[PDB]
Amino acid sequence: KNARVIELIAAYRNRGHLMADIDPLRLDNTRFRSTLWDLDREFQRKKLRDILSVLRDAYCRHVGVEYTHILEPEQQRWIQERVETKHDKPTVAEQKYILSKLNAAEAFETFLQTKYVGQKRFSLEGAETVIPMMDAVIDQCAEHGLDEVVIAMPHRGRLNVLANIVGKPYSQIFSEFEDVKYHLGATGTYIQMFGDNDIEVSLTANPSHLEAVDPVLEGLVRAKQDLLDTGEEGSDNRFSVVPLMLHGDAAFAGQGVVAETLNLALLRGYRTGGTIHIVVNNQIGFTTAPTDSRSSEYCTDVAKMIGAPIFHVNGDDPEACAWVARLAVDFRQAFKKDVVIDMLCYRRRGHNEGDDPSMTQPYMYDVIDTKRGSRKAYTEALIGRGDISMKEAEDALRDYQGQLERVFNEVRELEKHLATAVDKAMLQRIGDAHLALPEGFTVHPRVRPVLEKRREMAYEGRIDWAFAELLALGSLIAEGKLVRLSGQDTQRGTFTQRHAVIVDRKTGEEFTPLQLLATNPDGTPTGGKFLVYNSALSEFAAVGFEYGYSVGNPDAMVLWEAQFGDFVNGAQSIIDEFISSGEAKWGQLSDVVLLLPHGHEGQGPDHTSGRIERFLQLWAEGSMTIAMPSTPANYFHLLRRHGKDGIQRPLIVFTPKSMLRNKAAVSDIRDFTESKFRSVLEEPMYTDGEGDRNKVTRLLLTSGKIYYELAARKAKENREDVAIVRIEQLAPLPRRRLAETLDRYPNVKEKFWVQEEPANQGAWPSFGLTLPEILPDHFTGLKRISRRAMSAPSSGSSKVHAVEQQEILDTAFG
Amino acid sequence: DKNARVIELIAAYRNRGHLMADIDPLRLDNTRFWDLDREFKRKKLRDILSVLRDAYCRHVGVEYTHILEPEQQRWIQERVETKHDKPTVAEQKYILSKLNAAEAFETFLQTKYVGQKRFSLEGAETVIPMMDAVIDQCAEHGLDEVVIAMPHRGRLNVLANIVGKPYSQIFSEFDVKYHLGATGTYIQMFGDNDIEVSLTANPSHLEAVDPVLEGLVRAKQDLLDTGEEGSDNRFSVVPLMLHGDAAFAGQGVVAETLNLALLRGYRTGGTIHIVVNNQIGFTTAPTDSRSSEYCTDVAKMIGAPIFHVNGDDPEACAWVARLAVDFRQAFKKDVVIDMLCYRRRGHNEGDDPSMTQPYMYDVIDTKRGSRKAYTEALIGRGDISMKEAEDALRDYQGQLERVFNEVRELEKHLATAVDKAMLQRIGDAHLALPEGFTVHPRVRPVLEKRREMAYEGRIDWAFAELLALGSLIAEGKLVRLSGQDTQRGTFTQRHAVIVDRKTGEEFTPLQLLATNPDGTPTGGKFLVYNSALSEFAAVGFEYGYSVGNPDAMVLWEAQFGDFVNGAQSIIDEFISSGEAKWGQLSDVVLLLPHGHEGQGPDHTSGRIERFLQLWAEGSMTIAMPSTPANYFHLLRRHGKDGIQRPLIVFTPKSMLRNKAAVSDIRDFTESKFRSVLEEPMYTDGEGDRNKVTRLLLTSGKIYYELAARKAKENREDVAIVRIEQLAPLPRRRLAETLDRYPNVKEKFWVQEEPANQGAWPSFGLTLPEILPDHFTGLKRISRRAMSAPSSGSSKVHAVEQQEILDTAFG
Ligand SMILES: Cc1ncc(C[n+]2csc(CCOP(=O)(O)OP(=O)(O)O)c2C)c(N)n1
Ligand SMILES: Cc1ncc(C[n+]2csc(CCOP(=O)(O)OP(=O)(O)O)c2C)c(N)n1
Ligand SMILES: [Ca+2]
Ligand SMILES: [Ca+2]
Ligand SMILES: [Mg+2]
Ligand SMILES: [Mg+2]
C-alpha cells in the first residue's frame, strides 16, 4: 500500500503538469478525461487524503511544474519544498495591486487599438497577464537588492512594457508616432510598491528577426555585471544584473539561436547568473498551429537542454502568474541558473489588420470569441470568491477608466505641443610578462620557446603578427582598458600562435601573461583587465554575445575571433541586423571587433575566405571599419587606434593564417614606438631603401599576404618597372592617402588591382566600381588580376589552387 | 519501510543510474564513483539490485524517464531490465573483425599520407561496429536504405568499412573526398537481407548537413510511398546522423532539426543519432563547450531516449545500436547514442594536445586501442582461444597489407504555354469542394474570382503561381511547397489549403489536378505545408528534398526575403556552391518577398545584391518577375527544363494587389518566359520606339510607378525596359531590345534599393563590360547607399521613392 503511495507521489511530481488546468481556452477536451478507505490511513506522518490534496494543489491546478528532469537533487528539493506546502492566499491589497496592473495593461491596449491604425499586430489582448508577471519579476529582483533588470523581447506588447514596466511617460513613447519605436532601447527606474527598494530597468534594441537579440541580451548583461564587479568576473557572486527574456511560443521552439543561447547559461566566459525567460504562449504562430511548429509537448522543452525548471501557467490566473514570477527569481538567486515561465494565453485579434484568424483557425477563434479579457475575468472572480465587495469592484472599474482617460489625455496634450605609438619599455614589459611565471608553474616544453622568443622580440625586434596582437592588447590593459577576447580555441589560437593563456603541464592551472599588465610597476591597479575565453562551438550566439558585450560596456575592447572567416556566415543574422546596421537603425553603438582568418592557401572553400565582398557590400559611410593588415606593426596600430579613438564603430579584420609564420612578415621595434596605422603601404625599398619610384611604369594595387609573393617575384626578376602598393584599410577607402601615394609614381602607364579571390569576390566587385569614380585621374583604366569568378570561395583541390596562384603572379609580371 | 526503500531504490537507478555508469573509457573524473537475501514482490533483493546495476550502472547510461509517453518508458525498461544472453562467439569474432578493419584503415591512413591526423578515428574505432550494427538491424527489419550524414572524422573509414567502397575508388587522385556523397549496398553477414547505404555530401560547417539529410530522406520516403505521405508506416529510409560532442551542443541547427522530427511536413520516422564523444573540441574542454551534464541534452527537447555508451565496450555499443533501431521502428522517433571515446592524436599535424589538455593526454598516452583491448578481453573471459586470437591478429595484419597493396597498385595505373482548358480546369478545381464542405465566408470570393480569372483573364500573381504549379501536377510532377504560413500565404493571397469553417478539415484545390478527368492518377501530387518558425533547418530541408528527388518541384518561401539571412550557411555552403564543389545538383526554388513599401529594414529586402554576388555561370537562376504570366512561365520553365539548378525569385507584396499587375489569358496560352520585357505600347500598341531619347532599365514593381508617371506626363521621349531574369544576364535579348531604340542618348539603371544594394553593384560593373556598345556611360538612379536595406520610417521611404521617380523623369 505504502509502495503505491510513493509511486503516486512520484507520478504527480513527474507528470502532474500533463493534467494541470493551464490553458485558458481549454481547446483539448481529452486533456482531463484521459481505495476510499486508503484515503484516511496515515503514511513525517500525514493522511493520504492530505498528501493527495497537497499534490493536486501543487501540480494539477493553474501551474504545471516540470522539475524532475533536473539532475541536481538540491534543486529538485528546493522546488518541491516551496511548491508542496499550504500556500497563504494573497492579501486583498496584493490582489488589488495585481488588478491595478491588469487595469493599466488593458487600458493601454484599448487606447493603442482605438487611437492608432495598424497596431493589431502588436496587440497584447488576451496576454495582458504578462504585465503583472513582469512587474512581479522586477519587484522580486528589487526585494533581493539587485541593481538592474535588462529586458529583451519581440514587438508584441512592447509599448505596454515601456509604459507599465520600464515606466516611460506617454509623452516619450508616443512622440511623433507613425514603428521604429518597436525596435529601440530604453532605460528607466522601477520603485517598489510595498517595499523600500528601487531597481534600474532597461530594454535592449532588436530587429524584427525573432530571438536574434537573445545572445545580445546575455552579452550586454555580462558586460554590466563585469563593470559592477558582480558575477563570474566579480568579487561578489550576486550577479546583480538580471536578464529578463521574453519570447513567443512558435519562435522559442523553431529558432536555433534559443538553444545556442541556453547553452551559454553556465559557461565561465558567458554566464549571467541565470536568465528569467517568459514565453507569451498564445498557442499560435501567425496562422500556424503548435502541431506544425514543434515536435514536443511544450514550446519550452528546449530549456530541458540545461536542466532549467519550467513552469506552465494559466494566463487567466494573474495570482498564479505573479507567484511563479517571484518563485523564478528566488530559484535564479539560489542556483544562478535559468528559469522558464510558459504563460498560456491567447491572441484576441488576428495577426494583423487584414487577418480574419477564423479563416485558418476557426475552432480556436470561435472559443476566443466567447472569452472576456483577463481583467474582467479576474475582477468577476474576486467578486465571486468573496475577496472584494461590489464597492471595491466598482473602484477597480474606476481605476481602469481613470488609466484609459489618462493615456488619451496625455497623448492629446502631446499632440498639441590620436597617437598609438608606445615607448619601447611597454614592449619590454609585455615581453618580460611572458617569463614572469607564478612560483612552481610548469610550462609545457613546446610553449617555453614561445615565451622566450617573445621576450627576445620585445627587446631585439623581428616582432611577428601573434606577438604584435598581444603587444596591442597588453598596452591597452596597461593604459587601463578592459580587454575581452574570445572565439573557438582563442586562448591557444587555432594556428597554435596566440598562447594568451598557458596551461601548467602538471596541475592544469591557467596562467594569463597579459593580466600582469593590469598592475603598475609601483603595484597599483591600472583599472584594466584581460578577459580571454574559449567559446562554445557557436557563431550566431557567440557573435551576438560579443556585440552585446560592447553595447553593455562602450569602454571595453571586445574582440571575437572566427576559427576561419568562412564560418562567420553562421552569424549572418547578427552581422546584418546588429553589427552593420544597429547605429543607423536605432542609434545603438558598438565597438565590437571581428577577427576573420582569411587567405587562399589550398585548404578548400571553407578554409579560405572571410567573404570580404559581403562586408564591403554591407558597408556605408561611418558604419564600420574594414581592414586586411599585411604587417604585425600595422595590425598593432589598427587595434590601438580602434580602442583609443573615442568612436564606437565595429571593426572587421581579415587576419592571416600561414602569413603568421612568414619570416618576411615581421616588424621592427621603431614601427611600434615611432609610427602609426598606415591605411596605405609602399614597398620598403622606396621608403627605406635604394629603390627608384620614377622607374615604375606598372602599378600593382593589392591587400593582404599576396603582397609578399608579388614582392618575391619582383625581387627574383629585378623588376624595377613594377611597384606594389597595399590597401590596408579597405573601408572607408583611404582616398587621400591613396591619391598621395600614387602621385609619387609619375611614370605609371597601367594599373592593376591584384587579388587572390575570385573576380566576383574579394575587394574587386566594390573597388572596380568605386576607385574609378572617387579617383578618376588615378583609376580610369584600372584592370583586374584575380582568380576567375566562382560559385564557391575557391577550388576544393590544393593542386588547382597552386596553378591558379602561379597564374596570378605570371599575369601581374607578364 | 523496507519495501518502500526498495521501490525508491528501483526509481533512483531508473532515473539517475546513468550518473554512476562506467561510461568514460578514460575515467577522467575520479569523483564520479547486509540485507539482500530477503524476497520482494517474487525475487531476492540481491537479484533485483544486480539487474538494476547491470542495466543502468555498467557500460551503458540510459536516460529515458524524461520521456512523456509511458508506453515508451515501459518498452525501454522491459528490454534493458533483463538478464541479457551473452553474444555468440560468431558475433564477438564479427565485431572484432570490424574493429580489425577499422584500425587497419587508420594505421594505413596515418602512415601512408601526410595531413591526415585531423581526420583520425583512433580512439573512436568502435563507431564502425556500432554503425555496422545500426545498418544490420535496419536490414533485419527489411528496410530499404540507410542515408548517412557525418562530419570528416573517420569519413574514409566509413566509406570502406560501412558504405563498402573499394580502396581504388576512395584513394583515386588522393581532401574533396571528405565532402562527397557515396552510394553502396550492405549485405548481412548472419542474415539473408541486404540494404542500400548512402552518404550525403557536406561542407566543413559542422551540423549544417543535419536538416539536408532529413529533407533528402523524406524525398526518398515520399518516392517509395513510405511514411507520412505513404501507404505504409514503415519509414523504410532511415537517417543515420553522426556528430561530434562540441558541435552537437553548440550549433543551433541541431535543435532546429530535432524540432522537425515529428512534424507532418518534415518527419522521417525518427533519426538514429551517433555522437562521437571524444570529450574534447579541438583544444576546448566540455566545461567551455556546454552548460549541461551531457553533450546530448538538447535531444531531451523532443523526449528522445539517450544512451551513453563506453567506446571501449564494442559489444555494449553494438547492442545499443540495435536497441536504438528497434525503438525508432516501434515509435517513429529519434534515438540518440552518445559514444564516449577519445581522440588519440592532436586535432592536426602541428598540435601537441598536452599543451592545452595535459591531464587528458597523459591518460590517453596509457590507453591501448579498443581493438587490442577487446581482443585481450575476449582471451581473459575465455570467449576465444589463443589460436583464434592469433588468427584475429593475422586478420588485422592481412587487412593492413591489403589496403597498402591495393592503393600501391592504384598509384601504378521546350514550351511552357498551357491551353485554355488547363487554365479552366485549375479555376474550376477551386469550386469543386468536397461534399458538405463549408468554405469560410471571406475565402469563398477568392475561389469564385479564380474561376472568373481562368475564363475571363486579368489573372493576378497569386493565381498565376497556382496555375503554374497546378499545370505541372496535371502533367505528373510532384510539387512540394512550404514556408511560414505558406498554406494561406503571408499576404492572405495563396489559399493553397482552405479550412472547413465548421470541422477544421483541410481541402487542397490543386490536389484535384493529380487525377485525370478519366479518374486515373497523373503521377503528380501537391504537398503543401506550413513550416516551423525556422529558416536554417527549413531551407536546408528543402534543399535536401530537391537532392533526394530531382524530379520534384521544390519551393521554399520566406515570410519576407529579409529573414532568409537566418539560412545563410545553407545558401552559401549548399545551394549556391554544392554543384561546383561536389557535383551535387539541386533544383530548389527560394521565393523571397521583396520590395520598398515603407515597412522598415526587415520587411523590405531579400538582398538581391548578395545572391548576385554568389552567382557564377551556371550556378543559379535569379529573377524578379513583374507580371503574373512571366512568373508562371519562369516556374514552368524551371520545372520542365531538364536541368537541376536553384532558382531565386524576388516576389511581390503590395504588387500582388496592384490592378495593373494582371495578365491576359493569351500570356499563358501563347507566350513563353521573357527575360527582358518592353512596354506593351511598343510591342502591342501605337507607341513609337524612334521618339525615345532616354532609356530607363529596371526590374520589379517600380516599373508600374515609372509607367504611371510616363502616362501622366505623356513622355514619348522615355522608354522603360525590364530585366526579369537578373542572372544569367540575358545578354542577347538585352542587345536585341536596346537596338530597337536607335535615338537613345542616355541610359539609366533605376532601382528602389540603396546604391550599395539591389542589382546596381553587379550590373554597374558587368553591363558595360559584356555589352560596351550599349551600356558605356550607364548611370544609376537609386536610393542613397545605406548600412541597412531601408529607412525605419515610412515617411522617409515615401520621400525617397518620389525622389527616384522625379530624377528618372527630370
Ligand atoms: C527570424 C524570423 N522569422 C520569421 C519572422 C516572421 N514572423 C513574424 S511574427 C511570426 C509568427 C510568430 O509566432 P510567435 O513566436 O508564437 O509569436 P506571436 O506573434 O504569436 O506573439 C513570424 C513567423 C520573423 N519576424 N523573424
Ligand atoms: C560551423 C563550424 N564552426 C567551426 C568549425 C571549426 N572546427 C573544426 S573542428 C572543431 C572542433 C570540433 O569539435 P567536435 O564537434 O567535438 O568534433 P571532433 O573534432 O572532436 O570529432 C571546430 C570548432 C567548423 N568546422 N564548423
Ligand atoms: Ca573605437
Ligand atoms: Ca529545373
Ligand atoms: Mg505565438
Ligand atoms: Mg569532440
Gap between the Cα atoms of A109 and A395, Å rounded: 20
Q: DSSP secondary structure string, A529-585? A: EEEEEEPPS-SHHHHHHHHHHHHH-TTSEEEEE-SSGGGGGGGHHHIIIIITTHHHH
Closest residue in chain A to residue B791, using alpha carbons only: A585
Q: Kindly state the DSSP code that residue B591 receives in the 8-state scheme.
A: E
Tell me which residue of A5, A80, A74, A52 sits closest to B1, measured CA to CA. A5
Tell me which residue of A605, A799, A805 sits closest to B579, measured CA to CA. A605
Contact B303 A285 (CB under 8 A): no
Task: Determine the atom of ligand 2 nearest the C-alpha atom of B243.
Answer: 15
Gap between the Cα atoms of B241 and B151, Å rounded: 9
- Helix (H) or strand (E) holding A198, with range, is strand A198-203
Gap between the Cα atoms of A370 and B546, Å rounded: 45
Tell me which residue of A338, A317, A117 sits closest to A247, measured CA to CA. A338
The grid coordinates of residue B142 equal 527489411
- A–B: how many Cβ contacts below 8 A? 352
Contacts of A68 in chain B (CB under 8 A): 15, 65
Contacts of B801 by beta carbon, 8 Å cutoff, 6+ apart = B596, B705, B752
- Find where cell 517600380 sits: B702
Gap between the Cα atoms of A735 and A522, Å rounded: 45
Contacts of B169 by beta carbon, 8 Å cutoff, 6+ apart = none
Return the CATH class of domain A416-598+625-678: alpha beta
Report the DSSP beta bridge partners of residue B147: B198, B239
Distances (CA, A) of A602 to A537, A607, B721: 24, 8, 44
Q: Judge whether A492 is closer than 8 Å to chain B, CB to CB.
A: yes
Tell me which residue of A750, A620, A622 sits closest to A698, measured CA to CA. A750
Calculate how close chain A gets to B66, using CA atoms only, in Å.
6
Contact A796 B179 (CB under 8 A): yes
Q: Kindly state the DSSP code that residue B555 receives in the 8-state scheme.
A: E
Tell me which residue of A328, A319, A322 sits closest to A276, measured CA to CA. A328
Gap between the Cα atoms of B625 and B672, Å rounded: 13
What is the gyration radius of the CA atoms in chain B, in angstroms?
31
Gap between the Cα atoms of A212 and A582, Å rounded: 13
Report the DSSP beta bridge partners of residue B274: B242, B337
Distances (CA, A) of A321 to A127, A312, A399, B221: 11, 9, 22, 45
- Helix (H) or strand (E) holding B526, with range, is strand B525-530
Beta strand pairing call for B43-44 and A63-66 = unpaired
Neighbour tally for A747: CB within 10 Å: 12
Quickly name the fold that domain B595-620+675-810 has. Rossmann fold (3.40.50)
Q: Under DSSP, is residue A252 helix (H, G, I), strand (E, B) or coil?
A: helix
CB B452, CB B526: distance < 8 Å: no
Tell me which residue of B292, B18, B287 sits closest to A307, measured CA to CA. B292
Q: Say which amino acid occupies B809.
A: F
Q: How far is the CA of B61 from the centre of ligand 6 (A)?
A: 19
Report the DSSP beta bridge partners of residue B244: B276
CB B156, CB B265: distance < 8 Å: no
Gap between the Cα atoms of A400 and A403, Å rounded: 5
The grid coordinates of residue B23 equal 561510461
Contacts of B66 by beta carbon, 8 Å cutoff, 6+ apart = A69, A304, B300, B303
Helices (H), B141-202: 155-158, 167-170
CB A554, CB A219: distance < 8 Å: no
Contact B260 A295 (CB under 8 A): yes
Q: Under DSSP, is residue B490 helix (H, G, I), strand (E, B) or coil?
A: coil
Phi, psi of A793 (to 5 degrees): -60, -25
Q: Say which amino acid occupies A4.
A: R
Q: Under DSSP, is residue B202 helix (H, G, I), strand (E, B) or coil?
A: coil
Neighbour tally for A42: CB within 10 Å: 9
Gap between the Cα atoms of B577 and B203, Å rounded: 10
Phi, psi of B779 (to 5 degrees): -115, 160
Ligand nearest the Cα atom of residue A252: 1
Query: Which region holds residue A499: left if phi is over 0, alpha if psi is between -120 and 50, else beta?
Result: left
CB B51, CB B58: distance < 8 Å: no
- Breaks in chain B (C to N over 2.5 Å), named by the residue before each, are 33, 41, 174, 413
Sheet architecture: strand order including B306-310: B60-63, B306-310, B335-340, B272-277, B237-244, B145-149, B194-199, B182-187
Task: Determine the atom of ligand 1 nearest the C-alpha atom of A248.
Answer: 15
Q: DSSP secondary structure string, A143-183? A: HTT-SEEEEE--STTHHHHIIIII---HHHHTTT---GGGT
Return the CATH class of domain B59-411: alpha beta
Q: How far is the CA of A284 from the centre of ligand 1 (A)?
A: 10
Q: Under DSSP, is residue B489 helix (H, G, I), strand (E, B) or coil?
A: coil
Contacts of B312 by beta carbon, 8 Å cutoff, 6+ apart = B25, B126, B341, B370, B373, B374
The grid coordinates of residue A411 equal 497623448
Q: Say which amino acid occupies B469.
A: L
Please state whether the peptide bond connecting residue B728 to the residue before it is cis, i.e. omega within 30 degrees of 0: yes
Beta strand pairing call for B718-723 and B676-677 = antiparallel
Output the CATH code of domain A62-415: 3.40.50.970
Gap between the Cα atoms of A565 and A569, Å rounded: 8
Q: What is the 3-state secondary structure (H, E, C) of A607-624?
A: CCCCCHHHHHHHCCCCCC
Dihedral sign, Cα of residue B369, residue B370, residue B371, residue B376: positive
Gap between the Cα atoms of A165 and A190, Å rounded: 7
Asked whether the domain spanning A599-624+679-814 has the same topology as the one spanning A62-415, the reply is yes
Contacts of B750 by beta carbon, 8 Å cutoff, 6+ apart = B696, B697, B698, B702, B706, B781, B782, B804, B808
Gap between the Cα atoms of B37 and A753, Å rounded: 87
Distances (CA, A) of B251 to A260, A562, A702, B205, B569: 6, 14, 36, 10, 12
Neighbour tally for A732: CB within 10 Å: 15
Q: Say which amino acid occupies B271.
A: T
Beta strand pairing call for A148-152 and A241-248 = parallel
The grid coordinates of residue B527 equal 504537398
Gap between the Cα atoms of A585 and A770, Å rounded: 25
CB B246, CB B289: distance < 8 Å: yes
Q: HSE, CB side, 13 Å, CA atoms: give it for residue A249.
A: 28
The beta-carbon neighbor of B355 closest among A288, A488, A503 is: A503
| Architecture in CATH for domain A599-624+679-814 | 3-Layer(aba) Sandwich (3.40)
Q: For B312-358, list the strands marked E by DSSP.
A: 335-340
Q: Under DSSP, is residue A349 helix (H, G, I), strand (E, B) or coil?
A: coil
The grid coordinates of residue A325 equal 514570477
Q: Kindly state the DSSP code that residue B267 receives in the 8-state scheme.
A: -
Distances (CA, A) of B755 to A217, A731, B397, B706: 32, 16, 66, 18
* Overall size of chain B counted in residues: 810
Q: Which residues line ligand 2 (CB under 6 A)?
A: A 488, 537, 563, 567, 570; B 153, 204-206, 244-247, 276, 278, 280-282, 343
Contacts of B499 in chain A (CB under 8 A): 359-362
Contact B600 A180 (CB under 8 A): yes
CB A133, CB A314: distance < 8 Å: no
What is the gyration radius of the CA atoms in chain A, in angstroms?
31
Phi, psi of A151 (to 5 degrees): -100, 140
- Helix (H) or strand (E) holding B580, with range, is helix B578-582
The grid coordinates of residue A405 equal 482617460
CB B359, CB B28: distance < 8 Å: yes
The grid coordinates of residue A540 equal 550566431
Residue B372 is labelled as binding a ligand: no
Q: Judge whether B754 is closer than 8 Å to chain A, CB to CB.
A: yes
Return the CATH class of domain A1-61: mainly alpha
Ligand nearest the Cα atom of residue B347: 2
Q: DSSP secondary structure string, B24-66? A: -TT---GGG----SSEE--EEHHHHHHHHHHHHSSSEEEE-TT
Gap between the Cα atoms of B639 and B646, Å rounded: 11
Distances (CA, A) of A271 to A262, A309, A485, A556, B290: 10, 17, 15, 18, 11
Technique of determination: X-ray
Q: DSSP secondary structure string, A390-421? A: HHHHHHHHHHHHHHHHHHHHHHHHHHH-----
* Overall size of chain A counted in residues: 814
What does the longest C-alpha to C-alpha distance in chain B come to? 108
Tell me which residue of B124, B122, B107 sits closest to B344, measured CA to CA. B122
Gap between the Cα atoms of A28 and A26, Å rounded: 6
Beta strand pairing call for B589-593 and B553-557 = parallel
The grid coordinates of residue B638 equal 524551371
Please state whether the peptide bond connecting residue A513 to the residue before it is cis, i.e. omega within 30 degrees of 0: no
Beta strand pairing call for A63-66 and A310-314 = antiparallel
The grid coordinates of residue B80 equal 534493458
Q: Say which amino acid occupies A251.
A: A
- Find where cell 504537398 sits: B527
Tell me which residue of B596, B660, B599, B580 sits closest to B627, measured CA to CA. B660
| Architecture in CATH for domain B1-58 | Orthogonal Bundle (1.10)
- Helix (H) or strand (E) holding B722, with range, is strand B718-723
Q: Under DSSP, is residue B398 helix (H, G, I), strand (E, B) or coil?
A: helix
Sheet architecture: strand order including B694-698: B676-677, B718-723, B694-698, B746-754, B779-783
Q: Judge whether B652 is closer than 8 Å to chain A, CB to CB.
A: no
Beta strand pairing call for B306-310 and B335-340 = parallel
Tell me which residue of A607, A602, A566, A658 sits closest to A803, measured CA to CA. A602
- Find where cell 478545381 sits: B429
The grid coordinates of residue A703 equal 591587400
Q: Say which amino acid occupies B609.
A: E
Gap between the Cα atoms of B695 and A416, Å rounded: 48
Tell me which residue of A142, A104, A90 sits closest to A317, measured CA to CA. A90
Tell me which residue of A702, A687, A126 sits closest to A357, measured CA to CA. A126
Helices (H), A118-264: 130-143, 158-161, 170-173, 214-228, 249-254, 256-262
Q: How far is the CA of B534 from the centre of ligand 1 (A)?
A: 10
Q: Kindly state the DSSP code that residue A232 receives in the 8-state scheme.
A: T
Q: Under DSSP, is residue B193 helix (H, G, I), strand (E, B) or coil?
A: coil
**Which residues 576-605 of B are in CB contact (within 8 Å) with A?**
576-577, 579-581, 599-603
Dihedral sign, Cα of residue B514, residue B519, residue B523, residue B527: positive
Neighbour tally for A409: CB within 10 Å: 11
Q: Under DSSP, is residue A260 helix (H, G, I), strand (E, B) or coil?
A: helix
Q: CB under 8 Å, gap of 24 or more: what pairs does B112-118 form?
A: B112/B404, B112/B407, B113/B174, B114/B349, B115/B175, B115/B349, B117/B345, B117/B346, B117/B347, B117/B348, B117/B349, B117/B351, B118/B152, B118/B347, B118/B348, B118/B349
Q: Judge whether A805 is closer than 8 Å to chain B, CB to CB.
A: no
Distances (CA, A) of B254 to A193, B457, B511: 44, 47, 33
Domain parsing of chain B, residue ranges: 1-58, 59-411, 412-594+621-674, 595-620+675-810
Neighbour tally for B744: CB within 10 Å: 16
Quickly name the fold that domain B412-594+621-674 has. Rossmann fold (3.40.50)
